[PDB]
Scaffold this active site. Structure first.
Site, short mmCIF file in Angstrom:
data_model
loop_
_atom_site.label_atom_id
_atom_site.label_comp_id
_atom_site.label_asym_id
_atom_site.label_seq_id
_atom_site.Cartn_x
_atom_site.Cartn_y
_atom_site.Cartn_z
N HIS A 4 0.81 -1.23 0.00
CA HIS A 4 0.00 0.00 0.00
C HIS A 4 0.85 1.28 0.00
CE1 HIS A 4 0.13 0.43 4.55
NE2 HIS A 4 0.28 1.68 4.13
N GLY A 16 2.43 6.78 8.64
CA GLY A 16 3.86 6.93 8.37
C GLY A 16 4.70 5.79 8.90
N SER A 27 3.60 2.66 8.58
CA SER A 27 3.28 1.54 7.69
C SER A 27 4.51 1.00 7.01
CB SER A 27 2.28 1.96 6.62
OG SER A 27 1.00 2.15 7.19
#
Lengths: 14, 245
Positions: free
Chosen positions: B46, B196, B198
């Site tokens: 993602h 942030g 992730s």
């Protein structure tokens, strides 16, 4: 639509 | 990271900081990652799906600060950006949220181990710590809801793994969380990963060995009551990891 937070970094929809 | 502690890269030497170079030449921070072998960083699909152009990306190893240089830091380009082909996103949940970045310096070299740059071990097949196990997360992500800038200093915190049974409860995430995902949170909802963070690591001591158990994937809000962080369950993706590296 697209949520905020983790999952949506570096997205047009953010 | 909401709550937790400021940290330094030698305490998290597998941690990779991934930035994107924009049209215009400004650089923004994208996501975290983990170094699993000298040439390979693992992160979340993602983070890249809307901008799948690998020349955009800069990967740092050995970096403790967001916009300052750290002694011994090393800078890399992405030779290969591999996104999971069955990646998808629902209203909250992200599926198959895993990506590999083959890295090389401008000289063509992969990572060189040091006090501030080391690999993290992958787990074995379908072998995760028990629910209730304390694990660490690391990243440059938001510290508070009201943040409009990421923190300058790297952060870490400790959270506990939460059973799939608990995470599927209706006030948690219901059936939106799957067995290919791991939930982890603070019993008091005081500390958590956030935007942030992730793509960064969820690290657990498994058989006395620091193991990459999860990858920061999703969650409703940050440190929200009854809303755990959701992490890609790395132990499920070993065949995919092995076949692509």
């Amino acid at each position: 639509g697209x949520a905020l937070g983790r999952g949506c970094e570096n997205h047009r929809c953010l | 990271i909401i709550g937790g502690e400021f940290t330094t890269i030698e305490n998290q030497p597998w941690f990779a900081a991934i930035y994107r170079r924009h049209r215009g030449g400004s650089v923004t921070y994208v996501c975290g990652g983990s170094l699993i072998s000298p040439c390979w960083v693992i992160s979340a699909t993602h983070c890249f799906i809307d901008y799948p152009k690998k020349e955009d990306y800069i990967v740092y190893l050995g970096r403790s600060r967001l916009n300052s240089n750290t002694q011994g830091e090393m800078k890399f380009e992405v030779e290969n950006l591999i996104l999971h082909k069955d990646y998808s996103a629902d209203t909250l949940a992200h599926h198959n949220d895993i990506a590999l970045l083959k890295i090389r310096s401008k000289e063509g070299r992969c990572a060189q181990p040091s006090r501030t740059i080391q690999t993290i071990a992958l787990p074995s097949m379908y072998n995760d710590p028990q629910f209730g196990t304390s694990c660490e997360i690391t990243g440059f992500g938001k510290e508070q809801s009201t943040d409009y800038l990421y923190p300058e200093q790297l952060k870490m915190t400790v959270v506990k793994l939460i059973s799939h049974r608990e995470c599927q409860q209706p006030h948690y995430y219901g059936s939106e969380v799957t067995t290919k995902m791991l939930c982890a949170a603070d019993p008091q909802w005081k500390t958590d990963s956030c935007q942030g963070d992730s793509g960064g690591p969820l690290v657990c001591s498994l058989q006395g060995r620091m193991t990459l158990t999860g990858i920061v994937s999703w969650g409703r809000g940050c440190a929200l009551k009854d809303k755990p962080g959701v992490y890609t369950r790395v132990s499920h993706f070993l065949p995919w990891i092995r076949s692509h590296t």
